[PDB]
Design a binder for these strands. Structure first.
Ligand SMILES: Nc1ncnc2c1ncn2[C@@H]1O[C@H](CSCC[C@H](N)C(=O)O)[C@@H](O)[C@H]1O
Length: 352
DNA sequence: TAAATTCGGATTAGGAAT
DNA sequence: ATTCCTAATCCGAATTTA
């Protein structure tokens, strides 16, 4: 049974002890191509053991992105990248609630001792929840401090729904541009492209924390001085593309596979307004992307140097109330589609 | 009818006391 | 090996807005 590390610092995080500069990886796991798989860390029993077995028995690297941003994000990363001499993209985002939310100290109670947000999810706190918190604190506004039982109803619900103090006894959840900034994306990365505000919440909560991924992908910069061909599976709003962009790693070609059209619109928008000189190729459903097209694309452009993606975690997240059935759920089973495409790439890159 | 709103517990792990 | 607590958690779906 894989037991998650405590602290969840992986092979080491900036400004913290325990950095490991060398690991031994199984020979069946060696590149080329380099690959990078991501999923949530807190899965049902036995999920990561199944994932590792299908990804060459590489032990996952579990990192909580609270060591990179203000909001926790416990994820497991399986990859065959070198782990020595990583680096972070500058400047790093704000570390604490005080610095991330400057206007917060006007409304923040001193019995709310949070210095760190919980994980950014796809379903946001209710407006009726903000009211039930405002009504609970109302009968104690001329008292210096409300009682204890009134305090932890508010504190437990603020932690449960990731609420920040925005007004007088007003605890409201994060807005999309605040999620964008914490997740390492530039401002208004997901505003246009036909994305409704509701769709912005779901696309953001499902995405990478760019600084964490960029820290891991930073070892690629000395290896490829002329750029890389990238195979992006389950691209989303392009977390890996943004990370590679901030690392100043040229993207000669990006074959993206992402089924949501507004996500594909967000990526093409990002591709043009960053003036990417490379070519972007967008596919929709991974279940219709045949092995022969992969080989066909690899023969035109010369194989992929990196295969990066994160399969759906719908059936693995603890927030799922009706369909948290594990790796064989209808959406998270697309993890084996990731292994399918990756095996095609390895066939040409390394042989047998 | 796209968009917005609301509410709906269980599964893990760990600590600490039997 | 049990019991008992705190604690975090890339969510679905039914319904109403507009
Ligand atoms: N059948 C399918 N084919 C291709 N993509 C799919 C798919 N089913 C779900 N997806 C996509 O897989 C993505 C996983 S979310 C991961 C996206 C990435 N971590 C980011 O930075 O945004 C989702 O955006 C979802 O739309």
């Amino acid at each position: 049974p894989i037991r998650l590390p405590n602290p969840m610092i992986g092979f080491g995080v900036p400004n913290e002890p325990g950095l490991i500069t060398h690991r031994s990886l199984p020979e069946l796991a060696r590149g080329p191509p380099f690959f990078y798989y991501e999923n949530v860390a807190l899965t049902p029993k036995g999920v990561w053991e199944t994932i590792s077995r299908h990804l060459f028995e590489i032990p996952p690297e579990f990192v909580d992105s609270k060591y990179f941003c203000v909001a926790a994000r416990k994820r497991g990363y399986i990859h065959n990248l070198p782990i020595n001499n990583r680096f972070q993209i500058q400047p790093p985002p704000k570390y604490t609630i005080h610095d991330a939310f400057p206007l917060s100290k006007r409304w923040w109670p001193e019995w709310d001792k949070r210095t760190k947000l919980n994980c950014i999810l796809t379903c946001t706190g209710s407006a009726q929840l903000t009211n039930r918190i405002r009504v609970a604190l109302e009968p104690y506004n001329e008292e210096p401090e409300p009682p204890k039982h009134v305090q932890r109803y508010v504190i437990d619900q603020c932690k449960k729904w990731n609420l920040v103090w925005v007004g007088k006894n007003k605890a409201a959840p994060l807005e999309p541009d605040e999620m964008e900034s914490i997740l390492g994306f530039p401002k208004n990365h997901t505003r246009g492209g036909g994305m409704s505000r509701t769709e912005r919440f779901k696309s953001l909560g499902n995405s990478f924390q760019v600084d964490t991924v960029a820290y891991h992908l930073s070892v690629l910069k000395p290896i490829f001085p002329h750029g890389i061909n990238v195979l992006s599976l389950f691209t989303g709003i392009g977390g890996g593309e943004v990370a590679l962009h901030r690392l100043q790693i040229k993207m000669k070609l990006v074959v993206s596979v992402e089924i949501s059209k507004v996500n594909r619109n967000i990526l093409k928008d990002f591709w043009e307004q960053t003036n990417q000189t490379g070519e972007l190729i967008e596919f929709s459903d991974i279940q219709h992307l045949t092995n022969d097209t992969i080989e066909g694309l690899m023969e035109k452009y010369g194989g992929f140097d990196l295969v990066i993606g994160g399969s759906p975690c719908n059936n693995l997240a603890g927030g799922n109330r009706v369909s948290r059935v594990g790796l064989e759920g209808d959406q998270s089973s697309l993890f084996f589609e990731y292994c399918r495409i990756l095996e095609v790439v390895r066939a040409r890159m390394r042989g047998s």
